[PDB]
Amino acid sequence: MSLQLLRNTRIFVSTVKTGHNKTNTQEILVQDDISWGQDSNSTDITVNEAGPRPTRGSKRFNDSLNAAEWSFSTYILPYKDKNTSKQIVPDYMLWHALSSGRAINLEGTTGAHNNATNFMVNFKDNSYHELAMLHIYILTDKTWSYIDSCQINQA
Amino acid sequence: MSLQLLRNTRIFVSTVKTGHNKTNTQEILVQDDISWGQDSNSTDITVNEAGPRPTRGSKRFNDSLNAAEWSFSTYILPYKDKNTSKQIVPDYMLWHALSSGRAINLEGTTGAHNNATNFMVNFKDNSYHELAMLHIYILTDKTWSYIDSCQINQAEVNVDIEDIGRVTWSGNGNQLIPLDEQPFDPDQIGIDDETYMTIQGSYIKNKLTILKIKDMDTNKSYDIPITGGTFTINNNITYLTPNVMSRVTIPIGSFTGAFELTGSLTAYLNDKSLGSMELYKDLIKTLKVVNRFEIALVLGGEYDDERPAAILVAKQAHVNIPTIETDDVLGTSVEFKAIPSDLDAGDEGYLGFSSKYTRTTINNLIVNGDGATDAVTAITVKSAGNVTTLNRSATLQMSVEVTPSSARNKEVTWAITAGDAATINATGLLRADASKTGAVTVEATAKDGSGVKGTKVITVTAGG
């Protein structure tokens, strides 16, 4: 018995559906304009006669579900973390899933990779039919939910 | 011919239109700031053309009737009636209408209801689309006039030093109606001189204003002298009217909006511990979106002898970040708004009006909810046989005593805070074992939330 407010939403970005730790999931600081959902398709079958006393009745069938839509806005907030002493943006896995389709490796030289000087994102390794795969976890007040196998469409 | 005068106008509040008796009508202690009247909406039609002969024409039409406006202020003078010997404010159905929409019932537990000790008004049953329906009767000299189906929009309570305790009511009615015939004789319904003496026996002076402020995340009660305050209860009532072109229309019922209990308290900055400055700096230091505070404003002061006082109890309030106001001597203002435990759980707050308050009475009203039910004040944990220590691997069922002996809730919890060499259960059986050579403590706090503390340092030793 409770109502859920949008202001209490918290968003976590994950690459795994189990074994969640600090290297696979981090919170993403979102704003008011956050939105998510999933629409469904249907169809009406109607009989179209021409004579007197025609049949006037319809019928609906659920036929398919559309892809889930999500969107949110975040501040560009570069900083250096104390653990690794390398400049990193908090929503770095979002940048990686946008940039390349390989497993995340900040030590490398393609996609989202950081350094002791700056955090860098290059698109030299995005030749993939399925980029790095995320799972957006949504926490509104008390109830949980998530979108399965997301992909970063744009930024 | 005969001119009607304002000073001779008397107000009567009713719950029914016919068969008015003493239990449905009363004379209200209104002041000289009364005002009422119903206005109307009108439409003007103009014509704009470009021809050689312009049509400078204007046609007016009446469209609808707006809500009837009424507003008056009354003195806060709680008292006990001789018939029931229970403390009741003279204008009790006004508080009932402000509180909940059920039938008036002083013997219940929701809405405006009295008791042998004090009159308490909760808003626990306020979750209605339409509150209790009244009928404001206005007798100016001899001509009668009443406002149909009034509902209390807000109650303006002003709490300022140099100002006597008063409350201002403002609401709306479906349609003000003038009457030629007397609905009921005012003399026997109007209060007699004896109950006027009884009412004037109790005055509430706002000069004696003491505030109880306490955060529920730190339990840092403050000592704040009040310079002046104001808290109001708002129903956000809007009347719904139909839109018909052919004929005029009148409002039809209403839907109470969002319940708002806001208040503003002005107080001088103090450098003393638990003062205004400490509260301000704590609030401006711990910038948190949500606040949870015990605010208990006590109009009229507190005394050992029975004294008239007015009480507001906001259990879980929201304190807005104060803005220190510059003046001759620094006096800050704090704004609060009581939020509920859950949006539809009620319990926004409750009030206390009575001429007979002892500090214990107001204390148990604040903590337990009623001025009649007693609450624990001090607790000393009692060992099973005046025992002071314990040896390794020995059982000890803790007992406890509570005061006063007339407390309604006497059961306490059992917990261990300082030291890790023993355990305690729900009943209080403290148990030790081997490898327990350190001193440990035991705690006890009742579930009524008085803030009582039961402590005793038991010297748990290694044993023989």
From Swiss-Prot, chain B:
Keywords: Late protein, Viral genome ejection through host cell envelope, Viral long flexible tail ejection system, Viral penetration into host cytoplasm, Viral tail protein, Viral tail tube protein, Virion, Virus entry into host cell. It comes from the Viruses. InterPro entries: Big_2, Invasin/intimin_cell_adhesion. It is found in: Virion. Its main location: virion. Coiled coil: none annotated. Residues 375-453 form the BIG2 domain. It holds the Pfam family Big_2. GO terms for cellular component: virus tail; virus tail, tube. Polymerizes to form the tail tube of the phage. Tail tube protein polymerization takes place around the tape measure protein (TMP-pb2) and is probably directed by chaperone proteins. The tail tube is involved in viral genome delivery during ejection. Homotrimer. The tail tube is made of 40 stacked trimeric rings. Interacts with baseplate tube protein p140. This is Tail tube protein pb6. The lineage of its organism: Viruses, Duplodnaviria, Heunggongvirae, Uroviricota, Caudoviricetes.
